[PDB]
Amino acid sequence: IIRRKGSYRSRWGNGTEGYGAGVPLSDQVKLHCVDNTNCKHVRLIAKATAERFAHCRVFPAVAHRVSVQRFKGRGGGGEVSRHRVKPGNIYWVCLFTRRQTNTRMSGLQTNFDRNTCIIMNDQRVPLGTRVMYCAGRHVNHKYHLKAVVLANFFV
Amino acid sequence: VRTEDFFSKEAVSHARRVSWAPHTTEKKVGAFAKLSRSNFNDPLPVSFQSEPYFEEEIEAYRAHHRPDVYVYKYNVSPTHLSLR
Amino acid sequence: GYTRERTNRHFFVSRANAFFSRLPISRIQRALAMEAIKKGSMKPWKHTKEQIIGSPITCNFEYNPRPVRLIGTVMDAHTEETSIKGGLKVYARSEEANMMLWIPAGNPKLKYEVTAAKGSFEHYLDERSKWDEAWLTGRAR
Amino acid sequence: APASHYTFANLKKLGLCAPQVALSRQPRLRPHVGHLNGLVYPLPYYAMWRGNHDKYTYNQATPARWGEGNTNTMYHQHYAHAKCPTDYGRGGREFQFLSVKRGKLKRKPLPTVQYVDPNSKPQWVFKSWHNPLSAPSMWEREVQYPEHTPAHTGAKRPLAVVAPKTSHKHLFLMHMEKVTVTVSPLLFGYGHTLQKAALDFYRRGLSARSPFPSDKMFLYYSIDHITPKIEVTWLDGSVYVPPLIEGVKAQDLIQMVMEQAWLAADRMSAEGRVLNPIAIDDYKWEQLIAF
Amino acid sequence: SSKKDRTFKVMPVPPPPPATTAVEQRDDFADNRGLSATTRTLSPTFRMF
Amino acid sequence: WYRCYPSLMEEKDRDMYHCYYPYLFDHGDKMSLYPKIPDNPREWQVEQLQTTYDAIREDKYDAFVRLRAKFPELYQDTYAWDNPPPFGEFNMFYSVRFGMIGVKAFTCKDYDDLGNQFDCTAFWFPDNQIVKHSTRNGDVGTDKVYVGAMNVPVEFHKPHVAAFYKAAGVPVKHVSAGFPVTPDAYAPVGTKLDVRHFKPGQEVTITFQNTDYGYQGVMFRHGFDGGYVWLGDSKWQRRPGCMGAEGQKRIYPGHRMAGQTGASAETYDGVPVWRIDYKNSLIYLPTLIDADVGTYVKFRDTINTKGYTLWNEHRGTPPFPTFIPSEEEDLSKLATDEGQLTSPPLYMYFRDEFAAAQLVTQADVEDA
Amino acid sequence: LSEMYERDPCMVMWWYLKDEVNRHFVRKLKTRTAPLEKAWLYEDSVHPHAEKNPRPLVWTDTATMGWRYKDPTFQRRWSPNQFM
Amino acid sequence: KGWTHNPGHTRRGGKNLAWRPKISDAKLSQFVPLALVHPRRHPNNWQERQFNALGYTKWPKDIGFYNAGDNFEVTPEAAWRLYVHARDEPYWGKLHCEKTIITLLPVVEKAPKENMERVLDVFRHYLKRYGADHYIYNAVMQAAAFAKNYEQAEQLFKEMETLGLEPNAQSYVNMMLAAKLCGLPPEKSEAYFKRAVKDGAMQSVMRMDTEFRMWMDQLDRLGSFTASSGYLSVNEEGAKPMPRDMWAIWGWHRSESKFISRRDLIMQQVRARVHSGKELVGTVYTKTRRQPWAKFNGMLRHDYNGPSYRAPTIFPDAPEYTNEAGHKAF
Amino acid sequence: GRPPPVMGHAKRMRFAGVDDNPSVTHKPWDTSEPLMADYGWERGKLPKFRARSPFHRQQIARRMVTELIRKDYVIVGGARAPALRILADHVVELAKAGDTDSRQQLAYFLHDPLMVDKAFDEYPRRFRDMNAKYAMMTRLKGRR
Amino acid sequence: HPGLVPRDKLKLHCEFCRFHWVQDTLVVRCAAHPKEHNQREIWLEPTWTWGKQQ
Amino acid sequence: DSFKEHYHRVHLPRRLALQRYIKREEARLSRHKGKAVAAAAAAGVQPGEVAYKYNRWWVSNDHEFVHQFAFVEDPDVTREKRNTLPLVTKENIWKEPQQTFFLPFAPFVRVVDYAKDPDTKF
RNA sequence: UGUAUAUAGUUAAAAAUUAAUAU
Ligand SMILES: [Zn+2]
């Protein structure tokens, strides 16, 4: 639960004001996963008490629920090749981008359209094959990349 | 990779050490540089926590059977003087 | 117990704003921004319109894999002159994503060459609606 | 002539990273940032142990255990010969990791060697840690002059300086060759006398416990009221009579002759006599106490 | 409880002069000697009749 | 503060059998290995071997002073035993130069060769001159050098103030502050300090009056929570909580409280230096200070940074008394092109990406 | 008391005068301290008062016994008190 | 009801860093001096109470006086007056007599005629009680050296062989010292030292040329009483009737004290003069390993109230206490 | 540090420097604008004298300007004076420009039309050669 | 090291178990079984004071 | 005013008057040693001097190197600062930028001779 | 890697983003 303390010195601001800007994405923020899985991620609720890039996905392994929107459409036998997320499972998701101005130490501050993620297993092995979105430079850390093999290119 | 401390002691007194210069197989110029190829050890057992005080030790041949050679109530040795 | 919390000595309370005309502040910031267009970090701009839209090809030499090249459609023009601010705010629509990101324009790794003649008050509105429709339908609902 | 710091390339190779002295989030250790009130010197940590203050600093008296501030005017058999009464410094935790004084410096010159004629080129014997304490090259002079070489005795080098100091139970043949014990039974005495102290030394030597060769000890009844003599002869033939001071007894003589045995075997090793391997190690050196 | 007693307690006695009389100048509770042994200085001037 | 406590050496055991080198007893006249034998022989205690030639000491000491000459290459660092550092010369652990008064002038964003953006506040050093040298009763460690600033009409100062500068001989300076120096870092009254007195890679300590904010309440002065927005809270949106505990009756000194919120003397300890326009007397720091433009801010040096001296051998040695530019050199000729100094790269790696250790090359990307 | 002696040995003495001047004169603040500022504490003999000629103090300690440490804040609540 | 913004137990008031340093008492306690010595813990009232509480006595200067080194001495011409009185005593042993002669030296070098008969009367009588030994021979030879009567030193030395007594290891130094201070060149002391090395009575571990120097450079450090170069050439003595510090030590620890109660000095001189079945004797090993640190360390009953009170050993002293001079420095 | 030490928004004080810092917010720190409803104690704002509402304050800015033009003196009280003299240097900055944009930008502001008929005639003749500080703020002595 | 509640309970279990005056407190210290058989008499801490531990 | 604050607000101008005394006497001793003999004991050698301490490099009880720093500022050298002009700074100092990033120490034996004085650690 | 069925230990980078002097 990374907090700050509004005291004209400690203050999140809004982004758009330098590195270590603000708003670490409290507990449940309904991410929009982008792996090539059952997750249809009109919702995938967040469950860890923080999220950000300056807050560094590198360290925390932010547990995330899946407030599923749970498919576009699937079918077959009762039990199949497990990539099809159950409507209530929990996964250490990997946040890709944000809808918030994420300043970096290069002054480049990116604001994306939808704040997305990729479901990952308990062991940080991505539960998805491909990725249908970009991903800020906060990936490429050996934390997840060694399993997040560069499913695609970055921004 | 024993005891990660790694240069944790780096210290031996001028006393209680022995001497200064070793070398492995080579010589510098001095035409006599056959020194040791020496070893790098632990200082005298636990340094002074055990024995904080030491009594004055004379040279060995001056130590054993220290003769009693006095002048007027003082002991004159070839090296030491003391009021007996 | 107690504490001062306000130091009003003559050294702290006095202000040099009076004597400040001795310094040509901006004529330093000119030359300050002049020593950054010389190193190649930045290339001059004199544009108020004719830059509200264009076509930058960003080359953020991010050491991540390799330089990222994003065709973009500038929509800020933050400063209107060669000074330190810069600020293009290119839209840049990477492949499927929409990423309103603004380049500080002084950065040696974050280089970009815009081309005029498309600075159309139409083509600008072409993308604004494209990012207005992308903004709205991205809240995950 | 190396470089005392790693280089960036050297540091980068191993996979490590350069330590920031910079805007890093880390502590950037700088205690004395607000506590040390006054001029603070660029010696990193010279006021921490005191308590990270600079407060009092003017008093010269400090609670001094033996060998500290004002103890210098008392006789403590150790600090009498181990600290010049001048340099005695402040209390324990009030150590002087940095003492700044005002005045003109006077650097007194170093002392020179005594009883050494100038320019006399000495032969150099090099010692070091490597030598296990058994090594004869360990307990003797390092710089061997022609001045400290006894010539009235045959010596190739000045004799040893330091001698091992341990208690000897048994009279093992360290380097002696014949231990004769002369008494005159015409002299008599009941109770602990020198007659008794020397004759048990015969028994204590001839004991089935001491590894002394029983056939190499010679008793000798005298006649002319010869006080009990104990004569040991080393390989070089120089005889040695441990002085039988009154009140002596077995464990002293077995201690005298064995302790001197290391000195005398040293003198034999100085004249040039080759020495043998000794079985017993009265000085525990290859031993550790186990449980 | 009560107030602490902040009066002025009298001070303890000085040491008497050394003996050098052999008259048992040391004895304290004897009939001859008044307690006080004050042979101070120009006391011989205080010659009493 | 662990890792800050230096090697602990008890005074009771800094004696002969400890000294890393041969311990030297002084006799008042000359050093000698042995204790002084008191001349009144009665003064000797019984059974105290008054040593006059100890074959164990003298030979251990014979092996020191001889071997230092025989094999000099090895024992070079042991020459600070008898060859002490002279006074002056910028002793590494001792000397402390003064600082120079400054003025916040503007702010700019500046980047390295790498794309690290630094919000750079550029301080103008208008006219810095030594106005008076002080002391405290001529004691040690209590020597202070005072530095003027900002040449100013004699009218703008009160007559009692300006009558001081007029006495010292310096042109009347707008403001002056006192820096503690070690006596070997003095200069003559009337030295005109120049900005190059700092080195582009240094770390300076700045002190100023952080911008006044009035009389701000407690949710601004400090960080206080408090008050649900629409969930009750009759009149409690920002008021503090319980002052005392309950029964102390004595509101504990420092609770913090509402207050005057920041017109005080603030300090940044170890901000490094970025550039130096020694033609403009500008010095750029990669930070943002919270002071109104024109806030006179004094610049000492940062003394020791992470247990290591700032001005050591491997990391730059300063212009010791102060940088005095050469006689052939003047600034009226050159231009801002030539008057610009820059720093080493403060950050090891481009900071938007991670260190080369965490970023992974394609070799492991092709994990297989 | 020793950790107070590191800081200033004269303070160890001043703490005790205060305890004998505040043995009767605690009542009003003017006579609590005005005596204290009449004594001059010197951790060594050298002192600027040869110009005042301090006459020595002919006084030998009276109590050969040692000093008990009695807590300030020790309350006696009943005395030997003939009326028991 | 959790997650405080202000973690930690940084106390409120105790911040001065001089009277409460932020150092864990686990790591700070190791400086509390539990053997604290300089701010001494023995007032001056006791220094005399603990004197008599040993059985010690205060003698007038002429008999003796604790000298500058707090070592009790006997004044010559008060030493002889003992030997005049107690020579017949049954408890006046061998080494008592020679000790008289040694005390008669700082006068036999100052009064070489009036005190050279006392030496001989100690000599002549010593032989009548104890047959003939080296103590009396080394002593009187040393006395004859200081009298600057070198011929007497030679006239004594040649009687060692005449009595079979092999000249002791000192009997050369008593002679080496004589041939030096009597104004005779070297090769009259050298030829004596070279005698000693051959007979092994003296031992020299160095080339024989330099040991003899180290010998004389101690025998001129000890210059004669009437000269003005050396330690014996000093006449200043600390006149003190009692040592200024009755608890001084001569070892390492308070229980290694210097001044010992008569009633324990006796039970010491006993064990050093009996069989030694626990500690070996005449050897540099000393089985009884000194460990005056691992011994008791705590203030007893007699560290607070001070020493007991045993009445001063003092004389009714009928002899008249007359003060009728000032005597000093022999 | 990298972000401003005091983040996006905080009110410094009356009598405080600009202390420019990288920020998203917009501050004028300059008030060359004529006939402007920017009342405040900042730099780019003329002094906000007290009134019931920024509207009613603007209504006081009307009848105190149209009465300075009508008769060239108005004995105004308190923080209205430093707030009026800047409105007398604006009316002349409005009366000098002359274009029919300005003559309305004052017509919107004056309660009466004859004034905007006066201000544009006398002031170009009057202040043809004065270029700033058209209003003299001399303080009367007896406080109300 | 189990404080043997009175001094008198102290017993030397091992050959190497001896007594020691660890700062006025009679204790038992053994090289072997170093803390296994160690006993320490009950008494005030080595550095107490008159207001803290009476 | 507290107790400890009192003792100093009383003894602060009583210690200054004490040390200013000794110095004022230190000038007196500095006089009668001009015509007098070379030097007595007299608290050292009795000019206004500071003897040098060759005894500053210790190996503590824990076997770790402890160096004593002693600096003796010369009253004649410091005044020789406050009058003369300092020399023009060497261009190899300021025209060079001070390195930011002090790198860690690397151990090393000096030359082909393994002297190195740490005793070890392996 | 030491150790043994798995494997330690000074540190460094990053992260939790902020600096504080009454006469
Ligand atoms: Zn046991």
Side-chain angles (χ1 to χ4, degrees), chain C residues 103-115:
Chain C
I103 306 99
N107 218 344
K109 305 218 174 191
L110 275 51
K111 47 191 59 180
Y112 63 101
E113 303 270 342
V114 305
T115 318

Side-chain angles (χ1 to χ4, degrees), chain F residues 1 5 8 10 37-47 52-53 55 223 225 252-256, chain H residues 5-6 12 17 22-23 30-31 65 67-69 71 73 206 214 218 221 231 234 236-237 250 258 330:
Chain F
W1 282 354
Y5 281 118
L8 178 48
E10 291 274 49
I37 173 164
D39 271 328
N40 189 333
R42 298 151 173 273
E43 211 269 343
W44 310 350
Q45 301 276 331
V46 305
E47 304 176 358
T52 318
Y53 172 74
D225 313 311
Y252 279 166
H255 179 263
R256 302 168 281 280
Chain H
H5 292 281
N6 295 338
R12 185 55 138 270
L17 284 306
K22 181 51 182 57
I23 302 177
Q30 66 146 334
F31 302 118
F65 61 105
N67 52 21
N71 311 295
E73 85 151 3
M206 262 180 199
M214 281 168 49
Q218 300 289 277
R221 278 188 175 80
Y231 318 133
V234 191
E236 187 279 316
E237 77 271 12
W250 57 282
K258 186 173 169 180
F330 293 138

Side-chain angles (χ1 to χ4, degrees), chain K residues 40-122:
Chain K
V45 304
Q46 196 59 260
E49 91 286 13
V50 191
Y52 181 46
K53 306 202 177 302
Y54 290 96
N55 307 312
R56 289 186 282 111
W57 299 254
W58 311 97
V59 299
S60 44
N61 324 308
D62 304 359
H63 300 300
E64 54 158 9
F65 181 73
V66 192
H67 172 93
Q68 277 201 28
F69 283 108
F71 309 134
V72 289
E73 68 95 20
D74 304 60
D76 55 356
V77 176
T78 168
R79 60 165 183 76
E80 273 277 304
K81 296 266 186 300
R82 281 196 272 111
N83 42 37
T84 67
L85 276 300
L87 313 157
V88 305
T89 288
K90 284 189 199 173
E91 295 72 14
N92 62 72
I93 289 174
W94 56 278
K95 273 203 284 284
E96 175 58 31
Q98 147 163 4
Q99 182 161 156
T100 60
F101 267 141
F102 163 134
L103 290 181
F105 284 102
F108 59 97
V109 304
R110 182 47 161 282
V111 78
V112 188
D113 309 341
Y114 268 28
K116 73 149 174 44
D117 312 332
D119 87 354
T120 182
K121 185 44 69 176
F122 300 142

